[PDB]
Design an enzyme around this catalytic site. Structure first.
Site, PDB file in Angstrom:
ATOM      1  N   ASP A   1      -7.796  -2.559  -7.451  1.00 49.58           N
ATOM      2  CA  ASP A   1      -6.826  -2.696  -5.324  1.00 49.58           C
ATOM      3  C   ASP A   1      -8.748  -2.093  -5.056  1.00 49.58           C
ATOM      4  OD1 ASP A   1      -4.308  -2.416  -4.425  1.00 49.58           O
ATOM      5  OD2 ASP A   1      -6.249  -0.448  -3.391  1.00 49.58           O
TER       6      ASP A   1
ATOM      7  N   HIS B   1      -7.040  -5.526  -1.501  1.00 45.42           N
ATOM      8  CA  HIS B   1      -6.352  -4.935  -1.720  1.00 45.42           C
ATOM      9  C   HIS B   1      -4.761  -5.565  -0.286  1.00 45.42           C
ATOM     10  CE1 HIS B   1      -4.934  -2.278   1.765  1.00 45.42           C
ATOM     11  NE2 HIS B   1      -4.558  -1.256   0.946  1.00 45.42           N
TER      12      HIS B   1
ATOM     13  N   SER C   1       0.977  -1.047   0.147  1.00 47.75           N
ATOM     14  CA  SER C   1       0.160   0.080  -0.084  1.00 47.75           C
ATOM     15  C   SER C   1       0.737   1.001   0.574  1.00 47.75           C
ATOM     16  CB  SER C   1      -1.331   0.126   1.200  1.00 47.75           C
ATOM     17  OG  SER C   1      -1.912  -1.014   1.009  1.00 47.75           O
TER      18      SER C   1
HETATM   19  C1  LIG Z   1      -4.275   1.801   2.599  1.00 52.36           C
HETATM   20  O1  LIG Z   1      -4.196   2.640   1.381  1.00 52.36           O
HETATM   21  C2  LIG Z   1      -3.161   3.498   1.035  1.00 52.36           C
HETATM   22  O2  LIG Z   1      -2.073   2.782   1.623  1.00 52.36           O
HETATM   23  C3  LIG Z   1      -2.905   4.192   0.530  1.00 52.36           C
HETATM   24  C4  LIG Z   1      -4.020   4.600  -0.734  1.00 52.36           C
HETATM   25  C5  LIG Z   1      -3.798   5.199  -1.887  1.00 52.36           C
HETATM   26  C6  LIG Z   1      -2.034   5.416  -1.534  1.00 52.36           C
HETATM   27  S1  LIG Z   1      -1.257   4.776  -0.119  1.00 52.36           S
HETATM   28  C7  LIG Z   1      -1.623   6.401  -2.497  1.00 52.36           C
HETATM   29  C8  LIG Z   1      -0.524   6.735  -2.902  1.00 52.36           C
HETATM   30  C9  LIG Z   1       0.182   7.037  -3.807  1.00 52.36           C
HETATM   31  C10 LIG Z   1      -0.287   7.954  -4.487  1.00 52.36           C
HETATM   32  C11 LIG Z   1      -2.421   7.774  -4.765  1.00 52.36           C
HETATM   33  C12 LIG Z   1      -2.840   7.159  -3.741  1.00 52.36           C
HETATM   34  O3  LIG Z   1      -4.276   6.985  -3.558  1.00 52.36           O
HETATM   35  C13 LIG Z   1      -4.706   5.617  -2.744  1.00 52.36           C
END
Ligand SMILES: COC(=O)c1cc2c(s1)-c1ccccc1OC2
Ligand SMILES: *[C@@H]1O[C@H](CO)[C@@H](O)[C@H](O)[C@H]1NC(C)=O
Length: 343
Positions: free
Chosen positions: A245, A289, A145
């Site tokens: 995701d 996820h 993530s």
């Molecule tokens: C558990 O969900 C996470 O940890 C993350 C969710 C996102 C993250 S990390 C993210 C990172 C870089 C660019 C775009 C992003 O959109 C959503």
């Protein structure tokens, strides 16, 4: 079990100024080192960081961390759970900087929180060199993530750090799990582009230098998006990414009629397209996820090949291989069209 070591340089801190750290299980005789970056979203202003501090404090502080953790999935030392790297030296780096591993800002009279993710990685590497990492042949920087995005942001900096420190023989590689996001339009109307734009300023966030030089000042947020930063990287990076995701869908405000069906199918097609020229990748058509530290990470297959096998084939490729593929992207267009998707 992996044992906690708080950083000896106590100026490299979690959000609240407590020392950052790492969990380590050494495997004497192995010259492989796996450094895993934990994920868990981020926070980009005082108000939402304060809320995270109240109810997600382990992601902002080391004060309550346990003395040990069990290595699971790719961090497991049992070959049955981890056919890939069960004999490696195992490092789990807790995510306590809330900055997608990009920050280089200390807590001061002007900053309620420290955002030091990029410096945490550097300091963990520095302190590990005295604990056997100096003898490594391969350092695999992995993460899930936000930690998977952290791999993309930091793998070349680790490589440069080891070069400058005088260790040119350690091959630095990246494994980015569930950190390959699209800056796409939401299905229904703070979105990732805006969140990261604010975060970078709030965190004093840093991005890889070649990507920074392409996008230039004010546009560094682009480098948090895998398909934009990946082509600028020099270290070998293996990309693991569910086509659907759950965190991507969440930021897209997706939680089935024709409009949503088309939206989801287009999302999978776009993700597939961004991986077309990524030669080491594993991208199953599942709604899920993270994967790599789950105990049953061995079960999913693309085209009949599991992720541990694909990663082993990747190792061989860095010494096309007969029966040992490294580019595994599903082509079917709907979540769970792959029968091996997690239940
Ligand atoms: C558990 O969900 C996470 O940890 C993350 C969710 C996102 C993250 S990390 C993210 C990172 C870089 C660019 C775009 C992003 O959109 C959503
Ligand atoms: C401790 O870390 C800070 C920030 O990364 C760095 O400026 C400083 O040189 C480090 N000190 C030591 C003794 O490693």
């Amino acid at each position: 079990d992996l044992r906690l070591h708080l950083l000896l340089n106590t100026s490299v801190t979690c959000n609240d100024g407590s020392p950052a750290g790492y969990y380590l299980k050494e495997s004497r005789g192995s010259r492989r080192w796996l450094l895993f970056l934990e994920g868990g979203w981020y926070c980009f202003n005082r108000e939402n960081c304060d809320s995270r501090y109240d109810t997600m404090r382990r992601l902002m502080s080391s004060r309550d961390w346990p003395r040990t953790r069990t290595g699971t999935g790719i961090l497991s030392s049992q070959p049955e759970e981890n056919p890939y790297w069960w004999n490696a030296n195992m490092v789990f780096i807790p995510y306590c900087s809330s900055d997608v591993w990009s920050g280089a800002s200390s807590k001061s009279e002007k900053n309620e929180y420290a955002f030091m993710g990029a410096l945490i990685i550097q300091e963990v590497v520095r302190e590990l060199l005295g604990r056997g990492l100096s003898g490594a042949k391969v350092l695999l920087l992995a993460g899930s993530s936000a930690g998977g995005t952290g791999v993309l942001l930091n793998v070349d900096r680790v490589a440069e750090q080891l070069e400058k420190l005088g260790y040119p023989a350690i091959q630095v590689r990246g494994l980015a799990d569930s950190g390959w996001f699209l800056d796409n339009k939401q299905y229904r109307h703070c979105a990732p582009t805006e969140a990261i734009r604010r975060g970078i300023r709030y965190w004093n966030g840093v991005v890889p230098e070649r990507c920074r030089r392409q996008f230039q000042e004010g546009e560094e947020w682009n480098c948090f998006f895998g398909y934009k930063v990946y082509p600028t990287l020099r270290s070998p990076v293996f990309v693991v990414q569910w086509l659907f995701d759950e965190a991507q869908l969440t930021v897209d405000n997706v939680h089935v009629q024709e409009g949503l069906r088309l939206y989801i199918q287009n999302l999978g097609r776009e993700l597939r397209h961004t991986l077309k020229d990524v030669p080491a990748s594993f991208a199953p058509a599942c709604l899920s996820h993270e994967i790599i530290i789950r105990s049953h990470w061995t079960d999913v297959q693309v085209k009949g090949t599991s992720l541990p096998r694909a990663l082993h084939c990747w190792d061989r490729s860095l010494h096309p291989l007969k029966g040992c593929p490294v580019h595994l992207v599903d082509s079917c267009p709907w979540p769970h069209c792959n029968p091996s998707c997690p239940t």
